[PDB]
Amino acid sequence: SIKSEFAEGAAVFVEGVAVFLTMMAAFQNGDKEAVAQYLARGASLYTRHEELLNRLLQKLRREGNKEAVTLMNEFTATFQTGKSLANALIAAFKNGDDDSFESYLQAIWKVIAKMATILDQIAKAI
Fold first, then answer.
1. Are 76 and 115 in contact (CB under 8 A)?
2. CATH no. for residue 64?
3. d(CA 117, CA 106)
4. How many CB atoms lie within 10 A of CB 75?
5. What is the tally of structural domains in the chain?
6. Which residues have a Cβ under 8 Å from the Cβ of 5 and sit 6 or more positions away?
């Protein structure tokens, strides 16, 4: 159902946000081995989330909920376009470029915050 897919996607979002916050703290504390593990985990969370977003969008389009569809479109467009920032973050990790890594963490967080606002609006429109 729409509600089942939404709740499962929300829980993956919560996991990803938590991992991201933990990764920012590890980076600040100079624990790069932990940062590497969190970056690897974020990758599988991306795949898990993308599947749930697809499933939810299919169900929303079939039921014809216009407000929820347009919000979900913005969430998914941001999720997909934001992959470019994630790839740059990974590149900075591989290059040992901590200044760039820091910059992308802070820019990504701004996007995550926007996505969390959209997600709350989706919950109120389903």
1. no
2. 1.20.1440
3. 17
4. 23
5. 1
6. 52, 55, 56, 59
C-alpha span between 17 and 63 (Å, rounded) = 29
Say which DSSP state 55 is in.
H
Resolution in Å equals 1.5
Give buried/exposed letters for 38-58 (b at 16+ CB in 10 A, else e).
bbebbeebbeebbebbebbbe
CA 73 – CA 75 distance, rounded (Å): 5
DSSP-based helix, strand, coil % in the chain, nearest 5 = 95, 0, 5
Write out the residue range of the structural domain in which residue 46 sits: 2-125
